[PDB]
Subunit: 401 residues, 3 copies
């Protein structure tokens, strides 16, 4: 059922291709091989499982160190006393999760100043272009997207963006949509999402993004080819992380509020058709259950899984994770299998949604203002490609689990 | 005493008119007739009272739905447990009131994307121009101001602003000053201000604003005549609401702190004249009590009412409402009559203050940069006109109550 | 030992001078005389101690008035109940300290609108230029820096900045680096730092900054020679203070988190050399202990003092004060002498750090865009000069204490 899932996902991409005959079998064959093998290595092979576990524990340690800054600012409100007083409601999201975005943004900026990020990206991106035949720039952007967000990753190849082929630009877009970022990864981890899955999905996003970019927009043209000190670097990162944290916080207040209002209205509207219990989650579960089943979620869990996967696609993954997180605790409304939890975790791990197009337009567009028309034109296809990559990663994860 | 109040308010406007002889009796006669009749309909007439009550309950429901987003972000800190632990101080303004500005800003942006706002505005604005003979653009801006703020309302007629007559521009300014906005309305509602009064004052602001704009600046010239998707729209609204919420929060911290400092100084200064108990509230109550009496506040409550009305005028209505709100609870320093509470609520319901001029200069001015000189020149008169509109609405409300 | 400290500090500046032969003995002799005498007057002379105490009590009163705005916004979370529930962790830094930056920024803006700041600055700056022979503009900027921050102080002489001599510009830079600002002073006071020391250090920064600016960059060229209302002024100040408060909060979360991560890594790295207990504080204490000893800290307290002084220099003074503050309470890890507490307090009281260069580049540079190259070139020397001024003030304070 998983292998059928993989075939259908690949087939959809081929059906949507700008030119199926231009599809490079080495590129897309190798890309799928890498995404599949990467998953096999770290989710199934003992030595790989241990490397993943080791990496994840380090990430967990870094998060905990960063929480010392949070503890200073908010004191008792992020202490154990909160759970005694308020019970479950003692976990204040605004103080527990959002500040991690600030710390990690500062850390990443420091690692860029020190040249550490560039070193890792150069190695991974180099391996990708040699194996796949993808261009230098698009391969580096794909690798950068493992660690940073869709508008930050292309910065490592910013002078090459204005003259990128349409296929290159599309791949750059897909690499961002198929992945997340270090900051929010730590946020999702703080919400209870398994770090191993997040790290695995992040790394798998690089070949996965190239896979579906090159299936849906094969190359038909010919491609071509700093802060004053480390403290300034950290400060710049903290500032950017602050803006992100404020925006995420405002988005969540509004979007979760709007879903509640939508459910209030759907209840009244549904009542006209004998369904006063109608809610957005029900519509999404009903609509997306076949997709969840297709990627390997058991029949009796596909509807609940569909709620989260659907919400990620029609809104964004942060809102989706916010609703999925309770199902990872002991107080879960529905106790899901460990394979279903994993599949959902992987399928949600991406910036692939329609609103990300506007973000790419501004961020990626500022890097090449004459290409904004191209970005807008390819936006929906890029979101589909990114969605397919997330789904494929989830299917693969479901397979080896 | 109320009818004398109305006459005096109208008379002040005539005295201040740019040209009393140019005053159109159909326009200003009809405008007052509408504001008066609207008040009669929804505050006195049974069917109207029920429509107002019905509308207000829906608004109350929407607020409650939006608070689900707040609950997610701040958890226990906006739960019932807070009142057990901290008593009255368990109500954290920053978390209870300010986030509502974010949710409603997102909602309004969604309703604009969907064309719902434009539909309502087109009907109300159309009714106004046909009845009053006011221009198309200024009538639409007046109607828009019922729902959105002074810098947002003119956006519905933004290409007509640069070539507006001085009278039109003045009316656009007055419509914003005479009203509030959906976001802060929900904020004031969350503070305990009766939703019915806020909704009534908002609707009454549209004819009221035109009434005093056309009394004080009659037409002497001849007038003339988008986000990519709904999710982007919501996000844009949340972002704008976030900025508003942060600014309101900072303003309140500073202004309430400055009033405390001012009172500290006034105590020392007053002591020199045998009045060590001197405070800003006393000065304002003393100065504005005749105005409160004039609009229908009983003699023995006019001084307390004057404090709030005065504070609204010399600072802004948010600060005023922040100080008035305790008088709406059981722990009120002075138990005021229901008519006085209503009168104060109406009189405070407007952006009419001197600081709003600077806001109009930036917001409305960006729509027509060559008209910034005009905006500055007419600023004080526009604030007076807006104040008169609020006072008239309060007098009318006091009449039918 | 203190007089040797003063001599060494002066000597370092002479060694680093752009031209020792161009050093004006009247200027630098008088500047040191003023900084020394000011310290004698307010820290030793009874009448001066009483003026300082009186000024500090007023500042303390103003802070308390401003906290009424904080109380309104955050209610129970800044009440005495917090200490009952959470103990020491009941003091929430984000709500107790950061909002004071907002109130004071609004207050300062009001005092500028009213002409009060300009009056005081004119008198102090006038006294400085007449006594020292320093130029009008650089003397006014030095005096302004007593009250406002490094990018705000030059605004009082902004049309003279583009054509300043290199020596003048350097002095303007040094005056900002040698001092702090009214907003954060109130923040540091709220953290437990003695107001008397903060006020004393602020005033001593004006001659101290000129002293080391004129020692290290003597004049070799020839020098030359608004909000609509008070409510707008307050609002503008609140807005600027809000941005500062958000940035300081984000910086603290990130920097304190990064120090924790650094200590995690140093523990592992140190372990390789038989020092698993290695931390950043130990490195800094070891590196800066001789400097602390030099300025008058007793041998057995110099290492602990070095931690704070070192942290201020390599990061910034806010982070330094955040770590020093616990040592001012009863729960201090090490009970330090009152003289050591004072010396540390003075030595930390300055914006002198490398990151402040980037801030001067933006803020001061916008005032004279053609001088940004000069600012960058003189940045490190200016930070050294500012550091020397702070150290000299601490040595002087240690002397009379
Ligand atoms: C909160 C939970 C409720 C869920 C509700 C889900 C509703 C989803 C609406 C999607 O709307 C479409 O979004 C596209 C993507 O932006 C828009 O394309 C616009 O932008 C595209 C990419 O820029 C272009 O291809 C199109 O031409 C341009 O119409 C299109 O107009 C718009 O109708
Ligand atoms: C916190 C509670 C304490 C309450 C204190 C109340 C003090 C109120 C001060 C009002 O000050 C006036 O404000 C006008 C409005 O901005 C200014 O006009 C300025 O702007 C107007 C409109 O732009 C122009 O008409 C004027 O020419 C221009 O002077 C005017 O200068 C200023 O003196
Ligand atoms: C968190 C606690 C851990 C503490 C770590 C302490 C590390 C301190 C690093 C200082 O780094 C130097 O900073 C200078 C100051 O910015 C830079 O000069 C840069 O800027 C100067 C002033 O603009 C110019 O003089 C220089 O030419 C230019 O290199 C210089 O490159 C950079 O190497
Ligand atoms: O670093 C980040 C974090 C978030 N987002 C946007 O915010 C949404 C929620 O995380 C994402 O889907 C994406 O559109 C980014 O663009 N970059
Ligand atoms: O949508 C809004 C909300 C507030 N304000 C300004 O903020 C003050 C306090 O609400 C108002 O008087 C007005 O000047 C606006 O301009 N628009
Ligand atoms: O008004 C202020 C407050 C802070 N800072 C910067 O923030 C750091 C921490 O207070 C300072 O060293 C300085 O670089 C300023 O520039 N101005
Ligand atoms: Na990414
Ligand atoms: Na309005
Ligand atoms: Na200063």
């Amino acid at each position: 059922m998983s292998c059928c899932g993989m075939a259908v996902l690949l087939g959809i991409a081929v059906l949507l291709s700008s030119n199926r005959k231009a599809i490079n079998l080495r590129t897309v064959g190798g890309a799928f091989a890498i995404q599949f093998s990467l998953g096999a290595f770290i989710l199934y092979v003992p030595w790989g499982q241990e490397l993943l576990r080791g990496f994840s524990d380090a990430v967990s340690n870094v998060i905990n160190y960063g929480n010392d800054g949070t503890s200073f600012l908010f004191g008792g409100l992020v202490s154990g006393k909160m759970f005694e007083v308020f019970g479950g409601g003692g976990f204040i999201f605004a103080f527990r999760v959002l500040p991690t975005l600030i710390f990690f943004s500062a850390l990443i900026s420091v690692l860029y100043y020190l040249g550490v990020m560039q070193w890792v990206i150069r190695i991974l991106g180099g391996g990708l272009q040699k194996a796949l035949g993808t261009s230098r720039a698009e391969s580096m952007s794909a690798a950068a997207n493992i660690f940073v967000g869709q508008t930050e990753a292309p910065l490592v190849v910013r002078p090459f963006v204005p003259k990128m082929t349409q296929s290159e630009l599309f791949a750059v877009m897909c690499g961002g949509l198929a992945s997340i970022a270090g900051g929010v990864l730590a946020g999702y981890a703080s919400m209870g999402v398994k770090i191993e899955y997040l790290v695995a999905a992040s790394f798998m996003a690089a070949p996965g993004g190239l896979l579906f970019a090159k299936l849906m927009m094969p190359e038909t043209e010919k491609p071509q080819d700093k802060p004053a000190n480390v403290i300034d670097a950290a400060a710049g990162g903290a500032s950017a992380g602050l803006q992100l944290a404020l925006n995420v916080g405002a988005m969540l207040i509004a979007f979760i509020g709007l879903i509640a209002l939508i459910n209030g209205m759907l209840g009244g509207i549904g009542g006209w058709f004998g369904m006063p219990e109608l809610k957005l989650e029900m519509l999404l579960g009903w609509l997306f259950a076949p997709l969840a089943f297709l990627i390997g979620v058991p029949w009796n869990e596909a509807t609940v899984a569909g709620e989260f996967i659907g919400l990620k696609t029609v809104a964004n993954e942060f809102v989706a994770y916010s609703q999925f997180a309770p199902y990872l605790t002991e107080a879960a409304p529905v106790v899901l299998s460990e394979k279903t939890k994993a599949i959902i975790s992987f399928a949600l791990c991406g910036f692939a949604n329609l609103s990300s197009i506007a973000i790419l337009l501004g961020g990626l567009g500022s890097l090449a203002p004459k290409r904004r028309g191209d970005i807008a034109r390819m936006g929906v296809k890029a979101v589909i490609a990114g969605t397919l990559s997330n789904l494929m990663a989830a299917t693969i994860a479901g397979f080896f689990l």
